[PDB]
PDB file of all heavy atoms in Angstrom:
ATOM      1  N   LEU K  96     -50.055  -3.337 -26.904  1.00  0.00           N
ATOM      2  CA  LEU K  96     -49.652  -4.078 -25.715  1.00  0.00           C
ATOM      3  C   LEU K  96     -50.829  -4.042 -24.691  1.00  0.00           C
ATOM      4  O   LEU K  96     -51.830  -3.365 -24.843  1.00  0.00           O
ATOM      5  CB  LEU K  96     -48.406  -3.487 -25.104  1.00  0.00           C
ATOM      6  CG  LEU K  96     -47.074  -4.020 -25.681  1.00  0.00           C
ATOM      7  CD1 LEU K  96     -46.772  -3.355 -27.017  1.00  0.00           C
ATOM      8  CD2 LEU K  96     -45.956  -3.824 -24.677  1.00  0.00           C
ATOM      9  N   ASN K  97     -50.641  -4.761 -23.563  1.00  0.00           N
ATOM     10  CA  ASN K  97     -51.623  -4.780 -22.538  1.00  0.00           C
ATOM     11  C   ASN K  97     -51.513  -3.651 -21.577  1.00  0.00           C
ATOM     12  O   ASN K  97     -52.350  -3.536 -20.629  1.00  0.00           O
ATOM     13  CB  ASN K  97     -51.553  -6.106 -21.785  1.00  0.00           C
ATOM     14  CG  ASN K  97     -50.137  -6.443 -21.296  1.00  0.00           C
ATOM     15  OD1 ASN K  97     -49.234  -5.641 -21.439  1.00  0.00           O
ATOM     16  ND2 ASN K  97     -50.006  -7.600 -20.635  1.00  0.00           N
ATOM     17  N   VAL K  98     -50.484  -2.768 -21.672  1.00  0.00           N
ATOM     18  CA  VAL K  98     -50.411  -1.585 -20.819  1.00  0.00           C
ATOM     19  C   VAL K  98     -50.349  -0.358 -21.708  1.00  0.00           C
ATOM     20  O   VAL K  98     -50.748   0.763 -21.329  1.00  0.00           O
ATOM     21  CB  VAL K  98     -49.200  -1.684 -19.885  1.00  0.00           C
ATOM     22  CG1 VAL K  98     -48.872  -0.352 -19.222  1.00  0.00           C
ATOM     23  CG2 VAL K  98     -49.455  -2.768 -18.828  1.00  0.00           C
ATOM     24  N   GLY K  99     -49.775  -0.493 -22.905  1.00  0.00           N
ATOM     25  CA  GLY K  99     -49.593   0.590 -23.802  1.00  0.00           C
ATOM     26  C   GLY K  99     -49.640   0.177 -25.240  1.00  0.00           C
ATOM     27  O   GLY K  99     -50.285  -0.834 -25.562  1.00  0.00           O
ATOM     28  N   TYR K 100     -48.911   0.835 -26.089  1.00  0.00           N
ATOM     29  CA  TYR K 100     -48.851   0.525 -27.529  1.00  0.00           C
ATOM     30  C   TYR K 100     -47.508   0.990 -28.096  1.00  0.00           C
ATOM     31  O   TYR K 100     -46.780   1.733 -27.516  1.00  0.00           O
ATOM     32  CB  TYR K 100     -50.027   1.184 -28.285  1.00  0.00           C
ATOM     33  CG  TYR K 100     -50.086   2.693 -28.170  1.00  0.00           C
ATOM     34  CD1 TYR K 100     -49.463   3.512 -29.126  1.00  0.00           C
ATOM     35  CD2 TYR K 100     -50.732   3.258 -27.086  1.00  0.00           C
ATOM     36  CE1 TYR K 100     -49.558   4.897 -29.021  1.00  0.00           C
ATOM     37  CE2 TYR K 100     -50.770   4.654 -26.950  1.00  0.00           C
ATOM     38  CZ  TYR K 100     -50.193   5.441 -27.922  1.00  0.00           C
ATOM     39  OH  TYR K 100     -50.247   6.832 -27.809  1.00  0.00           O
ATOM     40  N   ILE K 101     -47.231   0.407 -29.303  1.00  0.00           N
ATOM     41  CA  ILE K 101     -45.927   0.702 -29.977  1.00  0.00           C
ATOM     42  C   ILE K 101     -46.045   1.982 -30.727  1.00  0.00           C
ATOM     43  O   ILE K 101     -46.863   2.142 -31.636  1.00  0.00           O
ATOM     44  CB  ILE K 101     -45.522  -0.435 -30.894  1.00  0.00           C
ATOM     45  CG1 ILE K 101     -45.129  -1.658 -30.049  1.00  0.00           C
ATOM     46  CG2 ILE K 101     -44.349  -0.024 -31.744  1.00  0.00           C
ATOM     47  CD1 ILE K 101     -44.605  -2.838 -30.869  1.00  0.00           C
ATOM     48  N   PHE K 102     -45.239   3.023 -30.351  1.00  0.00           N
ATOM     49  CA  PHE K 102     -45.264   4.295 -31.037  1.00  0.00           C
ATOM     50  C   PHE K 102     -44.486   4.231 -32.352  1.00  0.00           C
ATOM     51  O   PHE K 102     -44.893   4.907 -33.335  1.00  0.00           O
ATOM     52  CB  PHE K 102     -44.635   5.425 -30.128  1.00  0.00           C
ATOM     53  CG  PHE K 102     -44.869   6.772 -30.604  1.00  0.00           C
ATOM     54  CD1 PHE K 102     -45.947   7.109 -31.392  1.00  0.00           C
ATOM     55  CD2 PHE K 102     -43.968   7.797 -30.252  1.00  0.00           C
ATOM     56  CE1 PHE K 102     -46.169   8.407 -31.863  1.00  0.00           C
ATOM     57  CE2 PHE K 102     -44.192   9.078 -30.682  1.00  0.00           C
ATOM     58  CZ  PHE K 102     -45.295   9.365 -31.480  1.00  0.00           C
ATOM     59  N   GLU K 103     -43.426   3.429 -32.430  1.00  0.00           N
ATOM     60  CA  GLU K 103     -42.542   3.360 -33.574  1.00  0.00           C
ATOM     61  C   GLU K 103     -41.813   2.066 -33.495  1.00  0.00           C
ATOM     62  O   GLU K 103     -41.035   1.838 -32.499  1.00  0.00           O
ATOM     63  CB  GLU K 103     -41.610   4.590 -33.604  1.00  0.00           C
ATOM     64  CG  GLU K 103     -40.654   4.616 -34.837  1.00  0.00           C
ATOM     65  CD  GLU K 103     -41.443   4.885 -36.096  1.00  0.00           C
ATOM     66  OE1 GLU K 103     -42.554   5.459 -36.080  1.00  0.00           O
ATOM     67  OE2 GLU K 103     -40.889   4.491 -37.172  1.00  0.00           O
ATOM     68  N   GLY K 104     -41.922   1.224 -34.540  1.00  0.00           N
ATOM     69  CA  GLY K 104     -41.373  -0.079 -34.456  1.00  0.00           C
ATOM     70  C   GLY K 104     -40.623  -0.525 -35.687  1.00  0.00           C
ATOM     71  O   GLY K 104     -40.650   0.191 -36.737  1.00  0.00           O
ATOM     72  N   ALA K 105     -39.961  -1.652 -35.608  1.00  0.00           N
ATOM     73  CA  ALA K 105     -39.241  -2.289 -36.773  1.00  0.00           C
ATOM     74  C   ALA K 105     -38.210  -1.348 -37.384  1.00  0.00           C
ATOM     75  O   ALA K 105     -38.334  -0.945 -38.575  1.00  0.00           O
ATOM     76  CB  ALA K 105     -40.289  -2.735 -37.789  1.00  0.00           C
ATOM     77  N   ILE K 106     -37.155  -1.037 -36.568  1.00  0.00           N
ATOM     78  CA  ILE K 106     -36.030  -0.258 -37.084  1.00  0.00           C
ATOM     79  C   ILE K 106     -34.791  -1.092 -36.830  1.00  0.00           C
ATOM     80  O   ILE K 106     -34.548  -1.618 -35.747  1.00  0.00           O
ATOM     81  CB  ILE K 106     -35.933   1.088 -36.373  1.00  0.00           C
ATOM     82  CG1 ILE K 106     -37.289   1.812 -36.283  1.00  0.00           C
ATOM     83  CG2 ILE K 106     -34.847   1.947 -37.007  1.00  0.00           C
ATOM     84  CD1 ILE K 106     -37.738   2.266 -37.661  1.00  0.00           C
ATOM     85  N   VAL K 107     -33.969  -1.232 -37.903  1.00  0.00           N
ATOM     86  CA  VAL K 107     -32.740  -1.997 -37.888  1.00  0.00           C
ATOM     87  C   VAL K 107     -31.555  -1.043 -38.186  1.00  0.00           C
ATOM     88  O   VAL K 107     -31.603  -0.270 -39.167  1.00  0.00           O
ATOM     89  CB  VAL K 107     -32.692  -3.151 -38.876  1.00  0.00           C
ATOM     90  CG1 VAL K 107     -31.507  -4.021 -38.687  1.00  0.00           C
ATOM     91  CG2 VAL K 107     -34.002  -3.973 -38.737  1.00  0.00           C
ATOM     92  N   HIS K 108     -30.586  -0.984 -37.324  1.00  0.00           N
ATOM     93  CA  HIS K 108     -29.464  -0.080 -37.442  1.00  0.00           C
ATOM     94  C   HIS K 108     -28.195  -0.832 -37.903  1.00  0.00           C
ATOM     95  O   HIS K 108     -28.228  -2.047 -38.167  1.00  0.00           O
ATOM     96  CB  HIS K 108     -29.194   0.647 -36.094  1.00  0.00           C
ATOM     97  CG  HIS K 108     -30.346   1.462 -35.684  1.00  0.00           C
ATOM     98  ND1 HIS K 108     -30.761   2.612 -36.371  1.00  0.00           N
ATOM     99  CD2 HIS K 108     -31.190   1.364 -34.603  1.00  0.00           C
ATOM    100  CE1 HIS K 108     -31.733   3.180 -35.727  1.00  0.00           C
ATOM    101  NE2 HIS K 108     -32.056   2.431 -34.693  1.00  0.00           N
TER     102      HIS K 108
END
Side-chain angles (χ1 to χ4, degrees):
Chain K
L96 274 79
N97 52 2
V98 167
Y100 56 95
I101 291 185
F102 193 27
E103 182 66 25
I106 312 292
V107 188
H108 297 294

